[PDB]
Amino acid sequence: KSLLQQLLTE
Amino acid sequence: SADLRALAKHLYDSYIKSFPLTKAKARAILTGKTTDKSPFVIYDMNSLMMGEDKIKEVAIRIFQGCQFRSVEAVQEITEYAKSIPGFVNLDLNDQVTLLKYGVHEIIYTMLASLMNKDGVLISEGQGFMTREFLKSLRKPFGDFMEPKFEFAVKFNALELDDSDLAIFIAVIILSGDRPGLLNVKPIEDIQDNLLQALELQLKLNHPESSQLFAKLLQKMTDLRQIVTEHVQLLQVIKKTETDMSLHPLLQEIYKDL
Ligand SMILES: COc1ccc2c(c[n+](C)c3c4cc5c(cc4ccc23)OCO5)c1OC
């Protein structure tokens, strides 16, 4: 759900 | 000492990779010391219409252009935070929390790099919006930017360069006092090291600037008041301004805050 979380694992 | 300079250089190199528009490139544009450009100047409604192609009532369209630039900045700052040694090994929820509560302080910091007392570079340096024009927007829109201009003029008088800013931004992101952090100690340990690198950077790069380090610590306090004040203004906007709606990334950041 978190957008920041997906950004951080790219 | 040598380890502190290698950390400082690593952070500068990542900063250059993460942020396409640096303070050095921006002051060139602002002072007109560049070859390409110039930026299109937006100083009234007529020049706003003309400059539109770079890149709903006016206050609104402007406010909603700022969201997308803030959204791009969040992404660049995220990329930058992942280069700070130790940061990607932190609990992933703590990374999210550090960026959530830290990204606006960093945005306001780096926005000073694009400002002088007369206005602000926008669209990756392709436009310049005057301070006067922005204050002439209807309440409460005329007030968003002014306290950022007031911050930036005093911040800019410190004369930091990109090398200084890289470490200063990293210190701010590694703040162990953000709400809901699960494991504070590893974050303060990293920040303790970034603080010592910052101190040595200021000593060597600004040898005649007495107490510069103490002055930047105080700017970190001032950033928190700026962000508090900005959140209040946003609150007032949710309470009126009918159609308005944050970008989903901003909604995440603002959720609670
Ligand atoms: C991250 O870089 C940024 C980030 C935010 C902004 C920005 C420039 N402007 C004009 C605004 C802005 C202008 C406004 C406003 C709200 C605003 C909110 C943010 C920005 O409401 C009244 O007019 C910018 O410059 C390159």
Residue numbers in the entry:
A (entry chain B): 1432 to 1441
B (entry chain A): 208 to 262, 275 to 476
Task: Tell me, in the authors' exact words, what the paper reports.
Peroxisome proliferator-activated receptor gamma (PPARγ, NR1C3), a member of the NR family, is highly expressed in adipose tissues and plays an indispensable role in adipocyte differentiation. Nuclear receptors (NRs) are crucial transcriptional factors controlling gene expression that function as regulative proteins that bind to specific sequences of the corresponding response elements in the vicinity of their target genes. When binding to PPARγ LBD, agonists induce coactivator recruitment and corepressor dissociation, whereas antagonists behave in the opposite way. In this study, we present comprehensive structural and functional evidence for identification chelerythrine as a selective PPARγ modulator that potently inhibited CDK5-mediated phosphorylation of PPARγ.
To further understand the molecular mechanism underlying chelerythrine interaction with PPARγ, we solved the crystal structure of PPARγ complexed with chelerythrine at a resolution of 1.98 Å. The structure reveals that chelerythrine bound PPARγ LBD adopts a classical three-layer helical sandwich structure, which is globally the same as almost all NR LBDs. As a selective modulator with weaker transactivity, chelerythrine exhibits a nearly flat scaffold that is structurally distinct from rosiglitazone. Both ligands docking in a similar binding site in the PPARγ LBP, whereas the two small molecules orient in a perpendicular manner. Chelerythrine is docked in the LBP mainly through reversible hydrophobic interactions and water-mediated contacts. First, the carbonyl oxygen of the amide from Ile326 makes a hydrogen bond contact with methoxy in chelerythrine through H2O molecule. On the other side, the nitrogen or carbonyl oxygen of an amide from Leu353, Phe360 and Met364 make additional hydrogen bond contacting to the oxygen of heterocyclic chelerythrine through H2O molecule. Rosiglitazone forms a hydrogen bond with Tyr473 and His449 through its nitrogen and oxygen atom in TZD group, which further allows helix 12 to dock against helix 3 and helix 11. However, this strong correlation is absent in the PPARγ/chelerythrine complex, which is the direct evidence of the partial agonism of chelerythrine. As a result, the hydrophobic benzene ring side chain of Phe363 shifts externally from its rosiglitazone-bound conformation, driving the side chain of Leu452 outward even as the major conformation of helix 11 is conserved as in PPARγ/rosiglitazone.
